[PDB]
Amino acid sequence: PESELIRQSWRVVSRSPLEHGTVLFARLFALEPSLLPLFQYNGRQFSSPEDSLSSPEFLDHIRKVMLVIDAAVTNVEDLSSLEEYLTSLGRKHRAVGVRLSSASTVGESLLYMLEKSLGPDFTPATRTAWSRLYGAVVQAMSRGWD
Ligand code: HEM
């Protein structure tokens, strides 16, 4: 039932994944500015959050994030099926220097972007559904922090 709530809500945002993911990342850096230096491209550090939004590579990474979320939505009823992919994704992020602790801020940023996009439509069952999906995704990724 909640899996339908996820599919329904994702529909709207999935249509413009970069615009929506841009909200997610803007929120993320507003909450935890210390994540900005972890995006090292061309050996350089972004000075300010707005610098990231001018970077092709950074915007590409937004698209990657939204693609993975889309995969979880696709498999919302399965999700044993992404276990291995997510475990390795966690390993990768550990390697680029993301702390597992920062996953919750990412979660809050996702939930923020959904709330702002859905407005009246982001009902508390909708929040709860997404909290439990995202939490599941993070459980899988956390295996990669070994
Ligand atoms: C604090 C949050 C995050 C940071 C700092 C971060 C940073 C990075 C960095 C630096 C890379 C490698 C450079 C690049 O490909 O652009 C990367 C790759 C990637 N990220 Fe993230 N990321 C974050 C969250 C996420 C989330 C939540 C997802 C998906 C749910 C995601 C999906 C990806 C994917 C698919 C790749 C390509 C990885 C590979 O196979 O090599 N990221 N991320």
Numbering used by the authors: 4 to 149
From the paper:
Crystal structures of unliganded hexacoordinated F106A (1.8 Å) and carbomonoxy-F106A (F106A-CO, 1.75 Å), were determined to observe the effect of removal of the steric barrier to heme sliding posed by Phe106. At this resolution, we clearly detect the double heme conformation: the B conformer (canonical, 30% in ferric F106A, 27% in F106A-CO) and the A one (reversed, 70% in ferric F106A, 73% in F106A-CO). As compared to WT Ngb, the structural difference between the two conformers is larger, likely due to the wider heme cavity, created by the Phe to Ala substitution that allows conformer B to adopt a deeper position within the pocket. We also observed double conformations for proximal and distal histidines. The geometry of the His64-Fe-His96 bond, for both conformers, appears to be different with respect to WT Ngb and it might contribute to reactivity with ligands. However, the most striking observation about heme conformations is the relative position of the A and B conformers, that are laterally and vertically shifted, with their iron atoms being about 1.0 Å and 0.90 Å apart, respectively in the unliganded and in the carbomonoxy form. Consistently, Phe(CD1)42, a conserved residue involved in the heme packing through π-π stacking interactions, adopts a double conformation in a 70:30 proportion (lateral displacement of 1.0 Å at the level of Phe42 Cζ, not shown) in the structure of unliganded F106A. The effect of the double heme insertion observed in Ngb is enhanced by the increased size of the large Ngb internal cavity created by the F106A mutation, which results in a set of alternate conformations of proximal side residues that account for the enhanced biphasic behaviour in ligand binding of mutants carrying this substitution.
